[PDB]
Structures are given as C-alpha cells and as structure tokens.
Amino acid sequence: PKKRASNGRNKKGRGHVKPVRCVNCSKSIPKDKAIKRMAIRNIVEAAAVRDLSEASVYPEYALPKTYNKLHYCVSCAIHARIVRVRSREDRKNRAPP
Amino acid sequence: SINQKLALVIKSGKYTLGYKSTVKSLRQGKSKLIIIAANTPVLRKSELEYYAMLSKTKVYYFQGGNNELGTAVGKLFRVGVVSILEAGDSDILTTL
Amino acid sequence: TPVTLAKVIKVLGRTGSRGGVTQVRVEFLEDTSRTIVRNVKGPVRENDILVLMESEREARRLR
Amino acid sequence: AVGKNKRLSKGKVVDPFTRKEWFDIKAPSTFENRNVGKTLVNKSTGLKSASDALKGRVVEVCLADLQGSEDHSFRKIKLRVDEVQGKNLLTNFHGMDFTTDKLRSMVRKWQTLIEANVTVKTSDDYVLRIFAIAFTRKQANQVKRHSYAQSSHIRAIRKVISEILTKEVQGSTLAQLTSKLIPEVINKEIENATKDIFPLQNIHVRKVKLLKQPKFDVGALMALHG
Amino acid sequence: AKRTKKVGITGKYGVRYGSSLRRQVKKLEIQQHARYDCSFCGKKTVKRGAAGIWTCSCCKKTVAGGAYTVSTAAAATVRSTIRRLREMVEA
Amino acid sequence: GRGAPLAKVVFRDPYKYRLREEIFIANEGVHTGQFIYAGKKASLNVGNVLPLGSVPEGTIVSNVEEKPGDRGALARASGNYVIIIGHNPDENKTRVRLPSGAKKVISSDARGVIGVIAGGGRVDKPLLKAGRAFHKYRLKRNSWPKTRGVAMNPVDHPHGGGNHQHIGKASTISRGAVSGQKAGLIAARRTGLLRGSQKT
Amino acid sequence: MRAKWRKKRTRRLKRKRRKVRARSK
Amino acid sequence: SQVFGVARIYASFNDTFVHVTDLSGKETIARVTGGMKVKADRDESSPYAAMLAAQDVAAKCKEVGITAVHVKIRATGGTRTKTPGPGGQAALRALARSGLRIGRIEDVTPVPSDSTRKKGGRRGRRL
RNA sequence: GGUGAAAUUCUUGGAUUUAUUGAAGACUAACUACUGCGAAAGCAUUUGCCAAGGACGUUUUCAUUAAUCAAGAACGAAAGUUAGGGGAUCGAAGAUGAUCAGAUACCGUCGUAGUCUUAACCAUAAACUAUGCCGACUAGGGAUCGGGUGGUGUUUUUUUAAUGACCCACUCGGCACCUUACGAGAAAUCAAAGUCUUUGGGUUCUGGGGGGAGUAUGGUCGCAAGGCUGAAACUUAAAGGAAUU
RNA sequence: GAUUGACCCUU
C-alpha cells in the first residue's frame, strides 16, 4: 500500500533529480528525497569563547561561524535520529518544530 | 544579423557575385560595399582591399567560407566575394 | 601537579549508561564567571568544594 | 601510534630555528599599514642565495589588518614578494580573496545568487580575473517569501557587471585598481547601474586573481610608489 | 541501390580474414577513400595520396594529415590547446 | 619506410645568397605554401621550431632534440608527441613526457616542432595480409617473416628441438646473458597478461 | 528465491540449452 | 609588539594536525599531531591528544619566537566529512590556554564546487 | 592514511602536513524550492550562434483541416557490445587485511573492465503518478510559476511627466498542496480513482486462479548479451489485495 | 550500526 502521497520524496513534475551522496555513508540518494539539514555553528564551540576573547589580539572580534549543509540518506537520518518514525496521522505534518 | 541584412539586400537591392564582376564594378566605381569570404586566398583578399581603398569602398569580412557566403546570399554555389551595389530596403550600407 | 579549587554551582543531572556519574557545573574561585562542566563518580550536592588536577576540558553531551 | 613504526631508519643535531634568520614584509603604498609581519629563511650560504630563495613567496594578509578598519574584516589580500632590501623586503599585489565565513553567510536560499567573472587586462599588461557576486533581495513592503530573479534579469545583470568591470580595469593600472578596490566603489557603481533591473543586494566583488605578470620592474619608482 | 547488406567496400576481401577484421578495415577504408572539404578553396576535392598526405586536386595544395583521415581528433585537440597556450602567452 | 610524411622546407641563407632546403617531419596541419618560423622568438604555432624554454607547459612538441643541436631525436614516428611537463630555469632544464610515458629532463635549448606527427592512426588498420606485411617490410628491412625458434632444430636456436614444440627452460633470459643465449624475454621483470593501463 | 536471481538462473539455463542445441545441430 | 604565524589546524577524523608556519606558510614550526602524543591508534583524534599536541606546538613556537597566530581550521573536505573532527576545537582552546595570542580565526576546509566522486559506492558504506 | 578495538599499505633516499604553482580528466556544490522546461528518457558554470517549443495577448487568416490509433516508425536512464580517443576519481572482476564456525560477503587498501567522449549497436528499468489519450460537468480555500483587464498605491533621478520593482482586486494556462463527504472504493485512500445495477461522450492497449513460464518451439531484430511475438504437457486450493486484535 | 546461526507434529 502507498505509504505516502509524495512517495517518500518531493518530486512532482520532474521525472529525474540528480543524486546526492549521504554525509555519513556516502549512499547515493535523489536530492529531493534527502534529509538535508543546515548546520550553522560557532567555530569556538561556545565554551572556549571566554578563552578566545581574552587571548585575542584584536578587540571586538567578530568570531565567525561555520556554515554547511548535511545531506542525509533516509537510513542514516533515521539511525542518527535527525528524523524518526511518526504516527500515521502526523506523518502529514510538513511543519518543523 | 549579417545574414538577415544580406538576405534583405538580396530580395530588394542590387548585388553581384564573384571576383571578376566585383573587380570590374570596383574599377567602374559602382560598388558601394564588398563582402569577402573568410577562406578567400590572402592574395586575392589583399588585392580586393587595394581596389576598395582606391575606390573608397567599404570592405566587410564575412565570418564564413565561400560556402557559407553563398548560402547567406541565397545561392546553391560557392561565393568568394559579393559586391553590394545598392541596399534598397536594408541598412547594410548605412551601418558599419 | 597544578591543583585548582572549584565549587559546584549547579548539579546538571545524572548521566552515563548506568547512571553512576553526575554532570555538574563548577565555578572557579579566581577569574569570576569562569565555569566548567565536570562529572562526578559519587554523590554531589549544592555548595560543594572541589579539587581538579587539570581544568582545560569540558564534557557537553553523552549518549 | 608512539611505537608502531615498523621501520624508522631506512637509510641507516643542529637547530633549524637557530640556523634561520628573520625578515620583514612590507606592503605596497596602496595600503595604510606598511609592516605586515615577518618570515624566516636559512642563512645565505654560497649555494643557496637566501635572497632570491625567499623573494619568490606570497603572504595572505587580512584587509582589516592592512587598513586598521573593522569593515574590511571579511577580505584578504595576497601579497607577493618582489624585492629584498636589507631584512625589509617589499611585496606587491597578487590577488584579493574573500573569506569563507562571509561568503557562506551571504549565500542563502529563497533568493537568487548571481555570479560574473571577467579576465580583462590592465593598461600596464596585468591580466586579472575579477569575480563579482550579487544577490537578489527582498524589497520593502513585499509579502512574497522568496523574490527570485527571472533568468533574463540575471543575464542583463551579468552583462552590465561585465561591462562595468572591463571598463574599470581597462585604463587602470594594478595599483589604481587596488586603490579603487579598497573603497569598494565599484560595488556601488554596479548597484547604481543595476537597481533599475532588480534590487539585488550584496554586490560585494568577490576574489580577483592575477593570471599573469609583466617583467621584473626593479629600477626607479617603487621607492615612492611602495 | 545497395548490392551488399553490410560489407560495403570490404566485399573485395570475400569471406577471408574474419568478419571483425574486415569490419575495422571497412571503417578505415571508407575514411581513407572519402573526399574531404578543402579548407583553402572550399571544394570537396581533398584526396589521400599516401598515408598522411592529403592533396587538393583543385587548388594544388598538399596537407599533412592522418593516415586514413585528413585530420585526426588528436590533431584537432592539439591545435586547440596550442591556440589556448598561445593566447595565454600573448595575453 | 616512414609512416609519417616529410616536409621539404626551404630557408634563406643568412650569410650567402643561397636557398637552403631542409627535410622536416611533417606535423598535422602543415601544408604547402605555409610559413614555418624556427627560432627562439618564433611564435607558439603548429609547425614552428621553438626551443623548449620558449614553449610553455603542456605544449605538444615533436621532433624534439635530445641535446641542443642534434637536429631532432624524440617523438618522430607518426602520431607521436612530447608533453612539456615543466621548466627549471636555474641550470636550465625542461622536464618532458615522452611517447612511452618516460620522464626526461633535457636542456631548455633543445629544439622541437609544435604539434603531433602527421600520419597518425596508422596502426589502427589491420594489415589483413601476409602480402601487406611483405610490402611493409620490403622497404624497411629484412626482418620478415619470423620463423619461431621453437620450430627450429637445437642447432639453430635455444628453443629448437624436442619431440614436442616447447621452449623447455624458462623463456626469461638474464640481462647478463650472452649473444646466442639472449633469445626470448630479455631481463623481464614480469610476464603474462597484465591487468592495467600504461598510466604514463 | 529473489525474482532477479531466479531470472538470472533462467537466463543461464536458456543459454546452456542454446549451446547444447547448437552443438547437436 | 606581536610577531605573527599561522596555526594551520587540520582536524580530520582519526587525527588532528596542529602545526604553525610562518605568515607565508613556507617555513613551518613544530609540526605536531595527536598521533605523536597518544599510544592507542584509536585516540589519534581524541581531544586529549589534540590538546597535548597543541601544547607541544605552542611551547616549541614560543621557544622559536612567534607570539601570535592566525587560525586556519580545516577538516578533510573535498569528498570527505567536511565537518571538523573532535580535535580542532580542543586544539585552538589549548593554544588559547597556552597563552599564544590569537587573531583572525577562519575555517579553510576545502569545499568542492562539483567534486569528482565520493567514495563508498552508490549503496554507501553498509555498516 | 584508514576501523567498532585493528591489520595488505606509504614513511628519517622525508611519508602524510604546509609552499607558490603546473597538468589531466570528471563534475557543475552552496543558490536548489511540494520551483521551471521537455513526449518521455532527461535537463543546473558563462558568452555567442543555430534552429525549435508551450503558455498568454489578438475586434489577424484558413476553414472541420479533428480525437484515438492495427501495420509502420522517432527518441529512449543505467548496465552492456564494436573500434578510436580519454583515462583524474570511483570502481562488477580480481588482489588483499580483518571479524567469522566458515566469509571467494558486509568493513579496510589497491585495483583492470567500466565510469568521460567520438562513430555504430543495444531498446530494456519499481522507464512509477505502479493511475492511456481527447472532450464535458460537479464544497471551498492558504499558496506558487508563466503571462498577466485594473487600483491618479511606494524609490534613485526633480518629494513637484516620465522608461523600476513590489503591494492588493483578480481573469487564463501550468507544478502541486490544504478538513467531513456531494460521490467512489474492499479498504488504503481518491476533486478523481467522482458524474458506473439510476449501468452507453469518442477511442487505443492490456487481463481472466497460482505455478510450469516469459519457459519450449517457430518466426523476427541484434556482433553478442539478448529484445519482440509466444505456448502446451503437467502440477495445484489456494496464491494474492487493506494491516483489524 | 560487531560477533544473537539454527529450532522435524494437527483447526
């Protein structure tokens, strides 16, 4: 039986989507089907901020942050709990928390 | 485009094809422009340039061989040089 | 060995697979507003003093 | 890892830091701060010629450290050594490159990224590639969530940016291009020449790189000019 | 129209030498016996004299080309990369 | 006997009123009536004879001199070329890639024509015939046909003899062997079918 | 048996049958 | 005042390189890794080994003379994880606690625009 | 460098790490979306050229030229095949270390064919929306793409004509979405899978319990691998479709 | 994300 009306992906009017390699296992998955997430984090782990501020030469330093996009295959995303199995009624919740 | 302007000059204005007719018209001073194919011999191209400098005629170097020049002019043979005597309805003479 | 004295300011909660250790946050007597996340093998409660052989490490999450 | 080397001496001590000596790197005149740091080299024996052995190197220095300004902390400048003059060797422009954090900050979704590149040559025979990055922006009072461009606005923007960059670099020497690049005025020229096509925020000119260089130029002018 | 289904010019070898060898020979023999456009006079009059020699009957011009074609892909790529390097050197 | 066409190029004599004709190895694209420019300041065009120091990296050169002034030794067979891997201006030496994949460091003064040798693809055609092989070698040298040494008598070859046609001992022969012994696979590092490519 | 492997096995049987019949004829 | 070098942190998985070079990068000082500090092959990327190596390089570069560094953090990048390993944060923290002055922290992990091919097969690393 | 601890491995003739570079081949990241185009397959760096196409606008022209379609054809992912190029990466085969009772598997490092192109084949896919095409009609909407009747609604220029773009009524044509049932269905679910025992708008294809079997045989296309057409004997009471506890 | 392979009888 059809589990999802989207077929577990996001592809209506395409036919084919260029694949992406998973960040954990390097499994090839269609780009639209991935569990892509955005990781935007401080470079100093938010714990050594005091030490970096006191050891900085330059005052009022910007303290940049790192930006990347993690593309998860379905298996790796479920395993690492980026997403999880939901009840059937609330599988339809497109809204993130 | 150059091909569209050349087709318009073919349909409306006056044109001659070929080295001998082009040189004769350059001698008579009736040539208003000359288009020279890209693969024409350098000696013939330089002689045509000398004639056009003597008669104050504009020289346009087509971006193609004699086959492409003939196709642009609308013929099914090779054209090395084409002299435009008058444009009529095109702007090929007025521009460039 | 350089020994540093720190006092627990909040017992964050028990952690570890068997729960035998407790994550706490400790404040240093010198350099006010300097706190470090440490772990406890035995019991630990509010207002408790502390000896650390080294203090340049943190433990953020355990699973 | 300490003792896993199955072999350590296949073929079968002086201190390199003691054997090395310090130099000083001096920026061209186009930047405010002259001293940009120090570098090492082995002492000049008869078979190494430390002078030219070290004259062929480059240093990446932040534009904020070059100009003493906060608003240049997201730029870097490549400086390539050209002369040595008594432990105070002189450098010249190689290429500006943006910062990873800043580029990844201004690349975001629900908007269009526009990239252009031009390989125009200067008046003094420097061949350089300039990369301009612009971003379509959400207007005021707009309710639509994305505000993309329309792939013909993008082409027109790339056309005008290429024309602007060619016009600027043609006629301007490398020093003049650097001197008008620090004030990022070409960004505003692009903003003004584009604003009638799309709003297009964040017109920072991205990296510019030196593809090729002219001759040695070692005679009479860089004393005053760098 | 067609007197042979597939052998083509290799119908002179009959049944000898093996079908695969005859097929390779067929490809290269069509190539070497074709008439090529002259880049100088614009007429399809360039023929192979010997391996590497390609003469145009009209303009009386000899060209150095491939063994069985007037121009090989190796030569085309080499001339493109030589153009690229030359332009990079000049500017 | 040569698979590549030759070019007869005429130069002027700089010191005497005379025409000097040279016999070049034709590169692909060279034609009659073409101008060839040979020298240090010659331009990076197919058919020119620049030095390796003048040519840049990645240049396709042919008839490359092994030593400056030997008038061409390397990459002369049809379809062959040399890659300019790099330069080393101090103690001027150009590193090049040879048609066999070998790295060679040679002088920056060694000359070489630009392009690939004409007549390429020649060995892509089957000869199909002992007659074609006969005519190929009739004007190269008397090296054809080849009788197998295993089909001779023991007097005629190390492989001759036996009640079956077999080599008998290993066919890999030492480099230190002698004339009359060096028949087979001389100083072979390995044998058999190899799973791989040249990889330069 | 997975249907892909059953199909591959049937292909192998088919080509073996073809070879045997070719040998006989 | 301050004399500047470049810290050049490379926090891969199963190792962390912390090696300070000159401002040009052509003259290195104290190329030290967590592998040289930990015995077990599995802790070559441990934060403890990273901190140890950072202390070693800071001490040696103080013996050399450089007092401040510009931090260039780099993960394996290319087709690899592109995220920094456990060692880089501990390495820069250890430099700061060792007292080397710090300026211009930047991550320089090689990010491919259309990489060649990630390793692992289309079905991935089936573990 | 690698792994859950590890070990074929490279390495004080300097390995990995850091120069400034250079070459090659591949790819076209972030922008990138319940977004676009194409008949599907598929298609994501710039400029130019070459022809093509949908939608919209039209108080243009023709005038039924149309819908679906046996035969007959065009294209048709990947893998594969024949040659020539190319050959970085990854990598059926294979080499090889490990866990293992065994491991010619998963995991590790190499690694031919292949992966990339040029001519020629192949003609298959869970080629899927598992939903043929054309036409009509049936609760309502937050939105979006290409147009876009209109609203003396904002900016640089002149805040006091004017060639932007956005904001709101809103037609039209698309990719899709959001809550009972008007209805349908075995249900899952479906604005079509509705307007079907109140059964007929036109038309093509296909199926008739499970296996044997996509087999045998005969054709036919293909270099081959194989593709298309395609059974019977015999065996069998279930095999299947929705997850109700 | 290790090694947990197997288990002859009716509605």
UniProtKB/Swiss-Prot annotation, chain C:
GO MF term (any one): structural constituent of ribosome
Classification via PROSITE patterns: RIBOSOMAL_S28E
UniProt xrefs under InterPro entries: NA-bd_OB-fold, Ribosomal_eS28, Ribosomal_eS28_CS
Record PTM text: N-terminally acetylated by acetyltransferase NatB.
Major place of residence: cytoplasm
Pfam families xrefs: Ribosomal_S28e
Annotated GO CC locations: cytosol; cytosolic small ribosomal subunit
GO biological process: maturation of SSU-rRNA; positive regulation of nuclear-transcribed mRNA catabolic process, deadenylation-dependent decay; ribosomal small subunit assembly; ribosomal subunit export from nucleus; translation
Entry keyword set: Acetylation, Cytoplasm, Ribonucleoprotein, Ribosomal protein
Keyword set includes Cytoplasm: yes
Location in the cell: Cytoplasm
Family matches, as PANTHER family: 40S RIBOSOMAL PROTEIN S28, SMALL RIBOSOMAL SUBUNIT PROTEIN ES28
Assembly and binders: Component of the small ribosomal subunit (SSU). Mature yeast ribosomes consist of a small (40S) and a large (60S) subunit. The 40S small subunit contains 1 molecule of ribosomal RNA (18S rRNA) and 33 different proteins (encoded by 57 genes). The large 60S subunit contains 3 rRNA molecules (25S, 5.8S and 5S rRNA) and 46 different proteins (encoded by 81 genes).
Family of the protein in this entry: Belongs to the eukaryotic ribosomal protein eS28 family.
Extra remark: Present with 94500 molecules/cell in log phase SD medium. There are 2 genes for eS28 in yeast.
Protein name (record): Small ribosomal subunit protein eS28A
Species the sequence originates in: Saccharomyces cerevisiae (strain ATCC 204508 / S288c) (Baker's yeast)
Gene transcribed to yield this protein: RPS28A
Curated annotation (Swiss-Prot), chain D:
Name of protein: Small ribosomal subunit protein eS1A
Family of the protein in this entry: Belongs to the eukaryotic ribosomal protein eS1 family.
Miscellaneous: Present with 92400 molecules/cell in log phase SD medium.
Subunit: Component of the small ribosomal subunit (SSU). Mature yeast ribosomes consist of a small (40S) and a large (60S) subunit. The 40S small subunit contains 1 molecule of ribosomal RNA (18S rRNA) and 33 different proteins (encoded by 57 genes). The large 60S subunit contains 3 rRNA molecules (25S, 5.8S and 5S rRNA) and 46 different proteins (encoded by 81 genes). eS1 interacts directly with uS11 and eS26, which form part of the mRNA exit tunnel.
Post-translational modification: N-terminally acetylated by acetyltransferase NatA.
Annotated function: Component of the ribosome, a large ribonucleoprotein complex responsible for the synthesis of proteins in the cell. The small ribosomal subunit (SSU) binds messenger RNAs (mRNAs) and translates the encoded message by selecting cognate aminoacyl-transfer RNA (tRNA) molecules. The large subunit (LSU) contains the ribosomal catalytic site termed the peptidyl transferase center (PTC), which catalyzes the formation of peptide bonds, thereby polymerizing the amino acids delivered by tRNAs into a polypeptide chain.
UniProt-recorded Gene Ontology molecular function terms: structural constituent of ribosome
PROSITE patterns tied to this protein: RIBOSOMAL_S3AE
Example of a GO biological process term: cytoplasmic translation
Statement: the UniProt record of this protein carries the keyword Metal-binding: no
Region Disordered: start-end pairs: 1-13
Basic residues bias locations: 1-12
Top-rank taxon: Eukaryota
Keyword Ubl conjugation attributed: yes
Swiss-Prot record, chain E:
UniProt cross-references to Gene3D superfamilies, sorted A to Z: 2.20.25.30
Residue numbers of Phosphoserine PTMs: 39
Subcellular compartments: Cytoplasm
Keyword line: Cytoplasm, Metal-binding, Phosphoprotein, Ribonucleoprotein, Ribosomal protein, Zinc, Zinc-finger
One annotated GO molecular function: zinc ion binding
Pfam family, one: Ribosomal_L37ae
Keyword DNA-binding annotated: no
GO cellular component: cytosol; cytosolic large ribosomal subunit
C4-type zinc finger span: 38-59
Entry's Gene Ontology BP terms: cytoplasmic translation
Main location: cytoplasm
The keyword Cell division is assigned to this record: no
Protein function: Component of the ribosome, a large ribonucleoprotein complex responsible for the synthesis of proteins in the cell. The small ribosomal subunit (SSU) binds messenger RNAs (mRNAs) and translates the encoded message by selecting cognate aminoacyl-transfer RNA (tRNA) molecules. The large subunit (LSU) contains the ribosomal catalytic site termed the peptidyl transferase center (PTC), which catalyzes the formation of peptide bonds, thereby polymerizing the amino acids delivered by tRNAs into a polypeptide chain.
Family per similarity comment: Belongs to the eukaryotic ribosomal protein eL43 family.
Other observations noted: Present with 44600 molecules/cell in log phase SD medium.
PANTHER family on file: 60S RIBOSOMAL PROTEIN L37A, LARGE RIBOSOMAL SUBUNIT PROTEIN EL43
Protein name per its UniProtKB record: Large ribosomal subunit protein eL43A
Organism: Saccharomyces cerevisiae (strain ATCC 204508 / S288c)
UniProtKB/Swiss-Prot annotation, chain H:
Regions that span the bilayer: none
CC terms in the record's Gene Ontology section: cytosol; cytosolic small ribosomal subunit; nucleolus; small-subunit processome
Name of this protein: Small ribosomal subunit protein uS11B
Highest taxon, organism lineage: Eukaryota
Role, per record: Component of the ribosome, a large ribonucleoprotein complex responsible for the synthesis of proteins in the cell. The small ribosomal subunit (SSU) binds messenger RNAs (mRNAs) and translates the encoded message by selecting cognate aminoacyl-transfer RNA (tRNA) molecules. The large subunit (LSU) contains the ribosomal catalytic site termed the peptidyl transferase center (PTC), which catalyzes the formation of peptide bonds, thereby polymerizing the amino acids delivered by tRNAs into a polypeptide chain.
Record Pfam families: Ribosomal_S11
Keyword match Hydrolase: no
UniProt keywords, alphabetically: Cytoplasm, Nucleus, Ribonucleoprotein, Ribosomal protein, Ribosome biogenesis, rRNA processing
Leftover remarks: Present with 3370 molecules/cell in log phase SD medium. There are 2 genes for uS11 in yeast.
Subcellular location: Cytoplasm; Nucleus, Nucleolus
Region (Disordered): 107-127
Homology family: Belongs to the universal ribosomal protein uS11 family.
NCBIfam families assigned: PRK09607.1
Amino acid composition bias (Basic residues), ranges on this chain: 118-127
GO molecular function, one term: structural constituent of ribosome
Main location: cytoplasm
Gene Ontology biological-process annotations: cytoplasmic translation; maturation of SSU-rRNA; maturation of SSU-rRNA from tricistronic rRNA transcript (SSU-rRNA, 5.8S rRNA, LSU-rRNA); ribosomal small subunit assembly; translation
